[PDB]
Amino acid sequence: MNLRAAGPGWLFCPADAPEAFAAAAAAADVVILDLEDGVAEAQKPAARNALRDTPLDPERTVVRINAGGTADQARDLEALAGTAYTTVMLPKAESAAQVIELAPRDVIALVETARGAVCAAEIAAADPTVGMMWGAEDLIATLGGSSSRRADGAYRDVARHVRSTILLAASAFGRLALDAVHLDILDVEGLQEEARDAAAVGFDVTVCIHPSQIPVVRKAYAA
Amino acid sequence: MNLRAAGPGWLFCPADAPEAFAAAAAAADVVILDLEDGVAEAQKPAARNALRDTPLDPERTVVRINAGGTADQARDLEALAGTAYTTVMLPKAESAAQVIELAPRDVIALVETARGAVCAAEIAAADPTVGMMWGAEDLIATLGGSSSRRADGAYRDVARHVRSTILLAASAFGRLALDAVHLDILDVEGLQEEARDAAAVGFDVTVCIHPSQIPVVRKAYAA
Amino acid sequence: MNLRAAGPGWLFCPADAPEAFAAAAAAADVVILDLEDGVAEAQKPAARNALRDTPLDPERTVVRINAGGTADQARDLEALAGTAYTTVMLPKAESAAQVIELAPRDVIALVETARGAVCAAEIAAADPTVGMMWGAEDLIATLGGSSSRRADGAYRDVARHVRSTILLAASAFGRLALDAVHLDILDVEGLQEEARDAAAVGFDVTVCIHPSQIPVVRKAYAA
Numbered sequence: 140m141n142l143r144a145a146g147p148g149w150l151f152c153p154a155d156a157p158e159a160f161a162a163a164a165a166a167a168d169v170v171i172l173d174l175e176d177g178v179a180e181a182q183k184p185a186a187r188n189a190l191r192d193t194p195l196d197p198e199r200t201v202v203r204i205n206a207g208g209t210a211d212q213a214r215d216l217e218a219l220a221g222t223a224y225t226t227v228m229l230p231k232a233e234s235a236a237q238v239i240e241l242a243p244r245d246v247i248a249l250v251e252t253a254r255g256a257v258c259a260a261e262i263a264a265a266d267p268t269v270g271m272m273w274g275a276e277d278l279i280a281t282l283g284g285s286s287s288r289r290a291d292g293a294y295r296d297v298a299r300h301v302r303s304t305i306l307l308a309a310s311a312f313g314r315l316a317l318d319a320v321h322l323d324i325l326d327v328e329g330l331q332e333e334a335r336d337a338a339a340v341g342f343d344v345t346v347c348i349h350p351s352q353i354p355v356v357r358k359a360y361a362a
Numbered sequence: 363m364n365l366r367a368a369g370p371g372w373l374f375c376p377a378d379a380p381e382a383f384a385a386a387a388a389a390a391d392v393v394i395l396d397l398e399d400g401v402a403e404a405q406k407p408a409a410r411n412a413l414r415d416t417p418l419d420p421e422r423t424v425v426r427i428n429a430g431g432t433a434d435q436a437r438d439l440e441a442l443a444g445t446a447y448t449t450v451m452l453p454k455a456e457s458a459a460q461v462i463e464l465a466p467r468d469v470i471a472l473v474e475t476a477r478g479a480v481c482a483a484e485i486a487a488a489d490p491t492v493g494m495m496w497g498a499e500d501l502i503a504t505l506g507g508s509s510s511r512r513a514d515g516a517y518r519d520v521a522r523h524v525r526s527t528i529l530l531a532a533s534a535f536g537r538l539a540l541d542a543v544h545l546d547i548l549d550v551e552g553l554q555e556e557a558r559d560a561a562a563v564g565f566d567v568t569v570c571i572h573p574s575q576i577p578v579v580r581k582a583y584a585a
Numbered sequence: 586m587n588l589r590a591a592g593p594g595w596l597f598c599p600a601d602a603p604e605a606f607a608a609a610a611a612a613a614d615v616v617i618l619d620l621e622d623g624v625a626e627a628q629k630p631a632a633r634n635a636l637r638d639t640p641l642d643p644e645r646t647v648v649r650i651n652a653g654g655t656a657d658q659a660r661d662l663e664a665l666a667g668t669a670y671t672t673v674m675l676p677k678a679e680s681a682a683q684v685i686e687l688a689p690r691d692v693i694a695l696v697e698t699a700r701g702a703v704c705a706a707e708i709a710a711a712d713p714t715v716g717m718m719w720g721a722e723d724l725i726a727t728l729g730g731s732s733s734r735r736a737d738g739a740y741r742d743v744a745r746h747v748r749s750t751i752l753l754a755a756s757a758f759g760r761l762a763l764d765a766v767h768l769d770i771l772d773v774e775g776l777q778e779e780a781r782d783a784a785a786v787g788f789d790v791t792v793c794i795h796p797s798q799i800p801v802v803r804k805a806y807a808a
Binding site: 257279281285286296300301 | 523
């Protein structure tokens with residue numbers, strides 16, 4: 140894909156909702172059709188069917204598959220066979236090996252565990268990698284914690300640490316850098332603060348979970 | 363040891379004070395009998411004797427030995443021979459090699475120097491490692507600095523950086539993560555702030571230097 | 586050089602201004618004669634001549650050359666041949682290989698890109714390395730960002746992250762650690778805040794761009 144030529148506003152769309160695919164594509168620069176946590180276990184087969192029969196522009200669409208070694212990932216790659224999509228997003232990305240096993244597809248590695256953070260440079264350097272993202276929710280959950288943000292709403296230090304780690308790793312290897320979702324959709328103030336800062340430090344994209352977040356991201360990245 | 367099954371409140375007890383061993387054990391989830399900085403040079407031989415003749419439950423006791431390559435460490439491992447203790451804490455932990463040389467004991471690596479921070483993943487990955495701790499005092503001292511905390515009492519950035527480094531390294535390799543001592547014993551407000559945050563981000567333990575700190579730690583880690 | 590024996594106040598002096606060399610040397614502990622960004626492209630040949638015909642004490646002078654692989658660097662090393670200088674500062678330092686190729690000179694590696702940050706330990710460990718510095722301006726510029734500082738004037742997180750990275754890498758390998766320039770010359774309050782903190786955490790030097798910054802740095806590092 141010409142990832143950089145596409146704008147900064149990327150939008151998750153659960154793949155079990157094909158009636159929303161066209162609306163997502165019109166709202167966003169890039170849509171991430173989601174086969175992982177956006178879709179309940181029981182509707183994953185239906186999601187994979189929707190992925191096949193309701194296509195989007197593959198120049199502006201990536202598919203978030205399931206994690207390495209899972210039966211779900213294998214089912215996802217089978218469903219992808221029947222599409223035109225070239226680029227996948229790998230959740231819980233933890234090693235170069237997990238990225239390499241996805242060749243010949245392009246891979247956006249989503250680092251959201253300690254092992255992924257520790258191995259970020261190796262992940263970023265892997266040949267299939269075209270982008271790096273981070274996520275604070277599963278980072279804190281897999282660390283054994285309870286909250287990625289403190290009471291005043293700022294990310295805790297370990298999240299801040301991982302954010303910088305992934306920005307540096309991505310940039311060191313010439314990869315797109317994607318900043319984490321702002322989970323509080325109606326908190327447009329916080330999103331604006333994050334996206335302005337992301338743009339300022341060289342993130343290429345801020346990933347969104349609701350179409351209302353796209354204009355705020357696009358404005359933050361204006362220059 | 364079943365480290366995780368033991369609670370979050372660990373308590374240093376200088377090994378040259380056997381009259382306090384039973385009181386420490388009753389107050390704490392785990393006692394760290396200390397042969398390093400808790401004990402003056404001249405009383406280290408007496409500490410090693412106390413370690414032998416005044417036993418604690420080895421399921422709930424770890425021994426902090428002296429640093430790699432020191433004559434004191436060699437004397438410590440000799441004294442340990444006559445005990446039932448299985449788990450040691452290695453101060454100034456700086457390489458996998460320093461941990462491996464302690465096999466077949468289990469090792470909690472205490473990272474408190476730049477080299478330890480830089481090599482944290484290697485240390486965490488070493489076969490004997492069961493836990494990682496950090497310390498800001500000796501980190502700043504060995505860096506050549508003067509204060510780990512700024513005037514408003516917050517840790518300086520390099521300390522914050524090392525804290526996250528060790529949390530991630532420990533979690534990446536499935537090790538217990540131990541948060542640093544709160545040196546200002548009577549500052550229970552600061553300890554509560556640190557321990558609540560530690561619990562939130564996935565530390566397993568907050569290490570204490572005074573029995574009064576244990577209830578505050580236990581409450582912070584409640585869930 | 587006896588780098589540590591020289592004081593904490595280092596001062597950039599563009600090498601195309603030999604009429605200022607003596608004044609810089611009298612004001613500063615160490616002068617960095619600059620052949621890179623301090624000197625416009627068209628005056629670099631003149632700078633290299635000045636470097637030759639207007640000598641400073643080589644015990645108290647380092648030369649900032651141009652980046653690895655550039656034609657300018659090659660011209661710089663040729664000009665250096667005719668001087669007594671032993672120690673160079675390598676901008677945009679990105680690998681051990683870039684440092685090693687400067688042997689047998691001593692090298693202060695200036696990390697100011699993502700790749701340099703990611704490879705900081707390798708850079709620090711390289712045999713010619715005697716010091717590590719960081720720079721936030723080119724870090725943010727090469728990341729693709731727009732501002733190293735947020736609106737309240739604090740460094741953004743990625744800059745803070747790289748600062749700690751370089752401090753740790755330098756200290757882990759026994760190298761001098763140099764803190765970044767305070768670009769707002771008249772902001773002596775901010776410089777004092779930075780230099781006091783730098784001194785506190787174990788930086789050896791704060792690099793300056795104007796002689797007025799030297800007394801503030803010297804006082805901050807007093808103890």
